[PDB]
Structure formats: C-alpha cells, structure tokens
C-alpha cells in the first residue's frame, strides 16, 4: 500500500558514465572559413578565434550535463572551464585530426583543415606541430573514443588555482571518480597503457603553456596584429591572462 521510493528499474536502466559522455559529446562545429580571402596570419588566426568562440559555447553546454560536474560550486565550475579551455580545445583538435584524417592534417573544422602550408601561414607553425604531435600519438596508441571522452573530462580537471577551489574536497572526489573510469576502461579481459595515457595527459600541460603564451601575446597586441577575438574569448582570456601570468594557476600532474 506504500509506494517504494527506490527504483530497481531506474537503477538498472541508468547508462554508464562512459555512455553518458558519448551521449553528450558535442556535435562538430564549423569555422565559417572563407577561402576567397587571403590566407594571411591575421585572417587565419581571427578565423581560428571565431571557431574557438563557437566551440566554447558548446563546451559550456557539455559541462552543464557532465556527470559529477554539477556537484561542484558555481565558482569552481567557471574557473575550471576558463582554466582548461585551451587544453580541451587542443585535445579535441587532435581527436578530430586523428579520426577524420588519420592524423595527416589538423582538422580544426570540416570547412577548415590545415596542411603544412596553412600551418606556416598561420604564423604559429611550431605550435601547430606541437598539437599535430599529439594526433600522431593517438595513432601509435590507437586511442579509443571511450578513452578519449574520459581523458577530456580529466583535462577539464587538470588545472586549479593555487589557493584552491571553493570545494577542493568535492573536486577531488570527481577527479578520482574519473581517474577510476579510465582505470577500469584500460583494463583487459593494462598498467602500461594507463601509464602511456597518463603521461599523454601530463604532456598536455607544457603544450598548453606554449599555446597560451602565444594566445596571451596575440591578445594583448590584437590591435597592432589585427587579430580579432570574439566576445566569448575576450571574456575567457580577460580573466585567465592575469591569473595565469601571476602564477595563480596550478597544473595537476600524474607523474
Ligand atoms: C590567436 C592565437 O593566439 C592562437 C594560438 C593558439 C590557438 C588555439 C589552439 C587550439 C584551438 C583548437 C581549435 O580547434 C579551435 C581554435 C583553437 C582554440 C586556437 C584558436 C587560436 C589560438 C588561441
């Protein structure tokens, strides 16, 4: 006569966290690249920035439905996103390059694929090589989509403020849960692969530092360099630059 609150049906039908990530993976975004304009550094970079703005809008929508992310306080939900935006951007860039081009090119968007030439023309050739190296690693490792999605969540939880987050305890829980996910995922029916993946995540820090250095530089000199940044990026970079440059961003490592 009393309706049970617990639900055996609901509990069994609930998809795995790995299945939820697959369900919420953002759809590919177009850059709106106009090949009728010359491929100068000013145009290529502005285009990339516009693409970045469109991508971050989807990343935010992704962060709202991310399991466990809602357990953290709002302030720690914005800081983590502003701190890891470059890392998520570069890592998703490598995944698309790997899946869509076998890591032969940098697949920024279906309408914008960089070959060596555009890499030189972009005026950030070495950085492009840096991100392309990660794509090559996806091939040697035969990274799987499941491994990818988990790794991306970890990147979102890879950089925190020096003084700490509002809920450092809640943060530690979520990060631990996802590291577990990757742990059980890399398990054959294992430690060497888990090692290769963790070191891959760690290497993202130095790469991201280099990308950010170029980003902060082009941002402060955008007028002189004529590189346009969309609203979404001005917001993110205006908050991140003074924090990163002041030694207030702490990177988390596995090794
Ligand atoms: C203009 C500039 O400084 C460049 C240097 C690093 C570049 C970013 C590198 C990573 C990246 C990957 C993408 O798929 C979208 C654009 C972004 C987010 C790039 C936007 C333009 C940046 C920020």
UniProtKB/Swiss-Prot annotation:
The keyword DNA-binding applies. Ubiquitous. Highly expressed in distal tubules, convoluted tubules and cortical collecting duct in kidney, and in sweat glands. Detected at lower levels in cardiomyocytes, in epidermis and in colon enterocytes. 21-hydroxyprogesterone binds at residues 49, 55, 96, 218. Changing residue 46 to Q: Strong decrease of transcription transactivation. Changing residue 252 to P: In PHA1A; loss of aldosterone binding and transcription transactivation. One of its GO terms (cellular component) is chromatin. This is Mineralocorticoid receptor. It comes from Homo sapiens. The chain holds residues 722 to 982 of 984 of the full protein.
């Amino acid at each position: 006569a009393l309706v049970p609150q617990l639900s055996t049906i609901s509990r069994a039908l609930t998809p795995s966290p790995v299945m939820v990530l697959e369900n919420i993976e953002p759809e590919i975004v177009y850059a709106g690249y106009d090949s009728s304009k010359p491929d100068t550094a000013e145009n290529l970079l502005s285009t990339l920035n516009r693409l970045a703005g469109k991508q971050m809008i989807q990343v935010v929508k992704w962060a709202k439905v991310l399991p466990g992310f809602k357990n953290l306080p709002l302030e720690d939900q914005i800081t983590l996103i502003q701190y890891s935006w470059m890392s998520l951007s570069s890592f998703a860039l490598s995944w698309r390059s790997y899946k869509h081009t076998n890591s032969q090119f940098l697949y920024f968007a279906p309408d914008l694929v960089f070959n060596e030439e555009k890499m030189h023309q972009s005026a950030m050739y070495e950085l492009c090589q840096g991100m392309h190296q990660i794509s090559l690693q996806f091939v040697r490792l035969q990274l799987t989509f499941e491994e990818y999605t988990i790794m991306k969540v970890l990147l979102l939880l890879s950089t925190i403020p020096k003084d700490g987050l509002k809920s450092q305890a809640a943060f530690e829980e979520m990060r631990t849960n996802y590291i577990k996910e990757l742990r059980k995922m890399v398990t054959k029916c294992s430690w060497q692969r888990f090692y290769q993946l963790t070191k891959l995540l760690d290497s993202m820090h130095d790469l991201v530092s280099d990308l950010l250095e170029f980003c902060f530089y082009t941002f402060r000199e955008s007028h002189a360099l004529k590189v346009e940044f969309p609203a979404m990026l001005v917001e993110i970079i205006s908050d991140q630059l003074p924090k990163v440059e002041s030694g207030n961003a702490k990177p988390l490592y596995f090794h």
